[PDB]
RNA sequence: GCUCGUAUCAGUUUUAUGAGGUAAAGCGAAUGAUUAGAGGUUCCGGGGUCGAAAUGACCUUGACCUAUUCUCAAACUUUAAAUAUGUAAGAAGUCCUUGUUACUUAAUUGAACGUGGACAUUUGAAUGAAGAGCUUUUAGUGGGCCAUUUUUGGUAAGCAG
RNA sequence: GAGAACAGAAAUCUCCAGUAGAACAAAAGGGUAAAAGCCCCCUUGAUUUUGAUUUUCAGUGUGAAUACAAACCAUGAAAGU
RNA sequence: GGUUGCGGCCAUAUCUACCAGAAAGCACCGUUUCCCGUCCGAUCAACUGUAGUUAAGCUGGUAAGAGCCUGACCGAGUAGUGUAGUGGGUGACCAUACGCGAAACUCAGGUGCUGCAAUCU
């Protein structure tokens, strides 16, 4: 008979770590999550209450509720031909903030700084990001760097 | 270089192990208590083996731990009974030692016909200041190599005190 | 030994090649390299295989072993 | 060699936290004490940490952050004699005095000194710092004993009672104070008052003077030198209490010296690291002498 | 007379015909499932805010 | 059909940030399997020669460390890809007034919501958008099969999955 | 591993080493070391009310349940649980 | 700079051996009247810091140390892998084209940093 339990096929996924077993460091309990914060889900195998499902393992959501030792996270899950909004009551041990959102907020603050600078003098700030442009022309010297000619090597057993 | 490294008796454990329980066990606990001046602790069985006629949780043995001058005097009685002849093989590699005697009346206990004859083994655990360091709750530690006891040091100490020699083998 | 390996090839399935290894015997060192180490002292024979001297480790342990390399 | 730990064992060994392997903190209770209700987002959780060594009593008020725990107020038995208890700087009465000192110190620091005056007519009755109507709530701190064994009549609970009487709202029960009976679930106010004001020490001094002059002269030497007796010790305990209630401001010292000279002396007497070139020279000399036969 | 048991063939195509478009988001999401203590407090605070705003712009 | 004009978008990429234990690799790293020595074997075991005395001697099994050594693992693993995969790239946003609260704080401390103000043709990556979005109702279908890759059982099958 | 008269390969006692190689009702996989293991003390939160949520799912039901709320309790010095 | 209390990251912090430690800051103790707990003031509890050692817990330093971290145009653009062909080959498998890209090995370096408070020739 087939087996599809709550923690089915979660052996290595919920495997704790290598040389990171045991108690958890208290930074995780010290972190503060407010409503609207984007957070990453990585289940902790040593904590068994508030554990997320293996589907939500590795997903990212928005905090919508805060409780004593937990946080309500909203995840859009693809069910068939649409995403449904699932609400999870996860614990702070399993939950973790989003460096991507932190970086975006830092970029927003910087962007505002450059716009203020432009309003100060207007030096064509170009707020937006640009992709990797093709490299322009350059002149490379040969003094001290005379080209060393290479040739394909003959085959040898090397055993 | 020996401020506090001098040996001192940590404790003496008085142990008897009776093959069965019941009247023998309680009377032997009674004589051990009367000899030691304090109530002893009963030790159960750890598993079951048919040859010894024992089963799990049977109260196989009784033992006591005595420390201080009473331990020292009980040791003096033990060496007197044992003729102060001990063995290098008898001495352990961790610095502690011990030996077993029979007919506890030899120690100087008034013979009660009820209790009868009961042998017992004395084990002396020995160290220097620092036992608190090794077994205190806060900041557990281990004593150093120089501060650790050893067999040669303890045979030298045991000879020098009481002038009781040990046979070479 | 080439002919014996040819006969073993006959016994075996598939396609097999016979290669004259450039390493010294069953070691993993080329013959000049083993020769130089053995004229030197980083190589010392065990019963079947060979023991090698390490630039890292306990110097006194190497010296109680590998005496020829240091005193040669 | 039998005493040879395997490379695989040393590789797979997972060391505990540094304080755990130093045997200083219990991270179980530390988590239970530091973990804050997430609905109270950045509200600090304040611990009254009490620590006892012979010759020293440490009482601190600490909140916890990501970069480390930060100290709010601190009181020390080593500066207690400035307030007026010279001897017995690590007893139950000294713990009570230090708790009173830290409570008054933090109340003065944070502005809750006038309100929540504590208890001035101290008798030993078990009571908590109730909130005053139409006013601020009392400063709430939770006791932190670390690895110290919780038991009846302990100096940790002496400091607890000292802070509670000083005015800090410390949630606690009276079944651990000296004077609480196991058989009869009622605390003895007279016995607790005696323990607060050094009644057990006074009793010991009187009985030693009555029975054994030898020990009473070998020790209690400071009391004999400063002419202190059973009633005078209670008097000086009360005077220290009132002085603490008067000036808990924690006047500091100029250290009579300078950190620069402290560092210079410690550095010159300390040992120095060995450079990589020096290590290479050392192994070269070792191969030259031990291995190369000079 | 055995038959095919299960397959995921054609399923992604059928989904993507008129499928995986994102769900529509709203300002002021539903306050259901949040802490009822916070709900009571937010109700009272909103009532007070509306009263104060009307007083400010009578 | 309805509400709406260059839309709250995307089977795509980029930047930033997560998750994975498969391929590979590894076993002088854990577990399990496995070849061969050599060194020291004296805490029980086997026979031979010193041959009437024990830890007075040697060869073996090896109560057992290496310089070790040859091979492996779908239900082993420190490490660990590629392809896939979750988010974010703002106006429902960013900064001063804390205005309300019966929540919370030792505390006009925080939490949530908000009033006043500042931000234009780089409103905060690329590409595209053939009009976004939304509702009702109903047909047929609910025997599938076949490539290339991954892959299971089987000797294999125009076999079965 | 060493040591203690019966006592020896296995009875009880004592040191030393011991990253878990033990145990946690069961099958396997995770998880746990001042514990989630062993022992000791108290205890009934295995209580009431009806909501929200996850998992198979049609986002229907059954089975388990993750987080709360309003009470009443247990335990602990307390944080909390 | 030393030390203590509370810690953050949790071995660059662990483990083996040895050497050093002025002054401050746990010590064997004097102790068991009281609180308390054990067969045993060994653990725990309590009162004196007084006659007294750097014992050595602790810290620091040293090992061609084990381990553990950090790198490399060392291994190696190799194993593997996405995409393509009416490519090779009986096949097993292999090469090429557009991309991504390991681990083990081999060298080299390092052997705790740091926050709050208090204190120290």
Swiss-Prot record, chain B:
<dbReference type="GO" id="GO:0022625">
    <property type="term" value="C:cytosolic large ribosomal subunit"/>
</dbReference>
<protein>
    <recommendedName>
        <fullName>Large ribosomal subunit protein uL5B</fullName>
    </recommendedName>
</protein>
<dbReference type="GO" id="GO:0000027">
    <property type="term" value="P:ribosomal large subunit assembly"/>
</dbReference>
<dbReference type="InterPro" id="IPR031310">
    <property type="entry name" value="Ribosomal_uL5_N"/>
</dbReference>
<keyword id="KW-0539">Nucleus</keyword>
<comment type="function">
    <text>Component of the ribosome, a large ribonucleoprotein complex responsible for the synthesis of proteins in the cell. The small ribosomal subunit (SSU) binds messenger RNAs (mRNAs) and translates the encoded message by selecting cognate aminoacyl-transfer RNA (tRNA) molecules. The large subunit (LSU) contains the ribosomal catalytic site termed the peptidyl transferase center (PTC), which catalyzes the formation of peptide bonds, thereby polymerizing the amino acids delivered by tRNAs into a polypeptide chain.</text>
</comment>
<dbReference type="GO" id="GO:0005634">
    <property type="term" value="C:nucleus"/>
</dbReference>
<dbReference type="GO" id="GO:0006412">
    <property type="term" value="P:translation"/>
</dbReference>
<dbReference type="InterPro" id="IPR031309">
    <property type="entry name" value="Ribosomal_uL5_C"/>
</dbReference>
<dbReference type="Pfam" id="PF00673">
    <property type="entry name" value="Ribosomal_L5_C"/>
</dbReference>
<keyword id="KW-0488">Methylation</keyword>
<dbReference type="GO" id="GO:0005829">
    <property type="term" value="C:cytosol"/>
</dbReference>
Curated annotation (Swiss-Prot), chain C:
<feature type="region of interest" description="2 X 15-17 AA approximate repeats">
    <location>
        <begin position="20"/>
        <end position="69"/>
    </location>
</feature>
<feature type="repeat" description="2">
    <location>
        <begin position="53"/>
        <end position="69"/>
    </location>
</feature>
<comment type="function">
    <text>Component of the ribosome, a large ribonucleoprotein complex responsible for the synthesis of proteins in the cell. The small ribosomal subunit (SSU) binds messenger RNAs (mRNAs) and translates the encoded message by selecting cognate aminoacyl-transfer RNA (tRNA) molecules. The large subunit (LSU) contains the ribosomal catalytic site termed the peptidyl transferase center (PTC), which catalyzes the formation of peptide bonds, thereby polymerizing the amino acids delivered by tRNAs into a polypeptide chain.</text>
</comment>
<comment type="subunit">
    <text>Component of the large ribosomal subunit (LSU). Mature yeast ribosomes consist of a small (40S) and a large (60S) subunit. The 40S small subunit contains 1 molecule of ribosomal RNA (18S rRNA) and 33 different proteins (encoded by 57 genes). The large 60S subunit contains 3 rRNA molecules (25S, 5.8S and 5S rRNA) and 46 different proteins (encoded by 81 genes).</text>
</comment>
<protein>
    <recommendedName>
        <fullName>Large ribosomal subunit protein uL16</fullName>
    </recommendedName>
</protein>
<feature type="repeat" description="1">
    <location>
        <begin position="20"/>
        <end position="34"/>
    </location>
</feature>
<feature type="modified residue" description="Phosphoserine">
    <location>
        <position position="58"/>
    </location>
</feature>
<comment type="similarity">
    <text>Belongs to the universal ribosomal protein uL16 family.</text>
</comment>
From Swiss-Prot, chain D:
<dbReference type="GO" id="GO:0002181">
    <property type="term" value="P:cytoplasmic translation"/>
</dbReference>
<dbReference type="GO" id="GO:0022625">
    <property type="term" value="C:cytosolic large ribosomal subunit"/>
</dbReference>
<feature type="modified residue" description="Phosphoserine">
    <location>
        <position position="232"/>
    </location>
</feature>
<feature type="cross-link" description="Glycyl lysine isopeptide (Lys-Gly) (interchain with G-Cter in ubiquitin)">
    <location>
        <position position="161"/>
    </location>
</feature>
<comment type="subunit">
    <text>Component of the large ribosomal subunit (LSU). Mature yeast ribosomes consist of a small (40S) and a large (60S) subunit. The 40S small subunit contains 1 molecule of ribosomal RNA (18S rRNA) and 33 different proteins (encoded by 57 genes). The large 60S subunit contains 3 rRNA molecules (25S, 5.8S and 5S rRNA) and 46 different proteins (encoded by 81 genes). Component of a hexameric 5S RNP precursor complex, composed of 5S RNA, RRS1, RPF2, RPL5, RPL11A/RPL11B and SYO1; this complex acts as a precursor for ribosome assembly.</text>
</comment>
<comment type="function">
    <text>Component of the ribosome, a large ribonucleoprotein complex responsible for the synthesis of proteins in the cell. The small ribosomal subunit (SSU) binds messenger RNAs (mRNAs) and translates the encoded message by selecting cognate aminoacyl-transfer RNA (tRNA) molecules. The large subunit (LSU) contains the ribosomal catalytic site termed the peptidyl transferase center (PTC), which catalyzes the formation of peptide bonds, thereby polymerizing the amino acids delivered by tRNAs into a polypeptide chain.</text>
</comment>
<keyword id="KW-0689">Ribosomal protein</keyword>
<dbReference type="Pfam" id="PF17144">
    <property type="entry name" value="Ribosomal_L5e"/>
</dbReference>
<keyword id="KW-0832">Ubl conjugation</keyword>
<dbReference type="GO" id="GO:0008097">
    <property type="term" value="F:5S rRNA binding"/>
</dbReference>
<comment type="similarity">
    <text>Belongs to the universal ribosomal protein uL18 family.</text>
</comment>
<dbReference type="InterPro" id="IPR005485">
    <property type="entry name" value="Rbsml_uL18_euk"/>
</dbReference>
Curated annotation (Swiss-Prot), chain E:
<protein>
    <recommendedName>
        <fullName>Large ribosomal subunit protein eL29</fullName>
    </recommendedName>
</protein>
<dbReference type="InterPro" id="IPR002673">
    <property type="entry name" value="Ribosomal_eL29"/>
</dbReference>
<comment type="function">
    <text>Component of the ribosome, a large ribonucleoprotein complex responsible for the synthesis of proteins in the cell. The small ribosomal subunit (SSU) binds messenger RNAs (mRNAs) and translates the encoded message by selecting cognate aminoacyl-transfer RNA (tRNA) molecules. The large subunit (LSU) contains the ribosomal catalytic site termed the peptidyl transferase center (PTC), which catalyzes the formation of peptide bonds, thereby polymerizing the amino acids delivered by tRNAs into a polypeptide chain.</text>
</comment>
<feature type="cross-link" description="Glycyl lysine isopeptide (Lys-Gly) (interchain with G-Cter in ubiquitin)">
    <location>
        <position position="51"/>
    </location>
</feature>
<feature type="compositionally biased region" description="Basic residues">
    <location>
        <begin position="1"/>
        <end position="25"/>
    </location>
</feature>
<keyword id="KW-0689">Ribosomal protein</keyword>
<dbReference type="GO" id="GO:0022625">
    <property type="term" value="C:cytosolic large ribosomal subunit"/>
</dbReference>
<dbReference type="Pfam" id="PF01779">
    <property type="entry name" value="Ribosomal_L29e"/>
</dbReference>
<keyword id="KW-0832">Ubl conjugation</keyword>
<dbReference type="GO" id="GO:0002181">
    <property type="term" value="P:cytoplasmic translation"/>
</dbReference>
<dbReference type="GO" id="GO:0005737">
    <property type="term" value="C:cytoplasm"/>
</dbReference>
<feature type="region of interest" description="Disordered">
    <location>
        <begin position="1"/>
        <end position="36"/>
    </location>
</feature>
